[PDB]
Amino acid sequence: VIKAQEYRSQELNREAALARLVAMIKELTTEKKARRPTRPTRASKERRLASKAQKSSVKAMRGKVRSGRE
């Protein structure tokens, strides 16, 4: 439903109502693009694994030492 009264003569109002209809059908028929959700970077994956290995390398020599002598 369009109520075009922004102009004076019916030619202007008819072209204007057709313009509003064209515009609003265009706008209500354009769809947003589908957001492709990214995965983490391989650089970040290897950074993660390297941090893992570093904290593990520390914790290895950390803590209680084993022995076989008395």
Added chain:
Amino acid sequence: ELQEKLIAVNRVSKTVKGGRIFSFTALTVVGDGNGRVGFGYGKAREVPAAIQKAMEKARRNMINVALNNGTLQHPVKGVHTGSRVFMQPASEGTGIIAGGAMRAVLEVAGVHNVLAKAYGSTNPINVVRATIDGLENMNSPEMVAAKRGKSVEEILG
């Protein structure tokens, strides 16, 4: 003869310009089990040598203890470097209720009956020094009746 109980081993580091330097710091409490007791800290680059070197200082750093019947003489506190330790004489059955790094020093000092506790920080070196502090500043009825010129019957009642 001579109980030489290890207590702890720790892997210490030095972080020299090329890389870390891993050492090992033993800790060994030695003693006859009748009043003789000492502790040697000891550190070296390999655990056998570290333990041996710790035993060396533990031996040459012995102290006496005037203990009664294999138990303490009176409840004693042993504060040292933020590690407070409350030890208490017990009766002929209770064994040795001591924490970590304190069971060893008590068993080797020879106190068979004791009730202990380790307040504050429970770092082995600190609790060892603390327990030995306590077992050293302890009073025996002989010593007390000697300080106060008094008979033992007079001191003990």
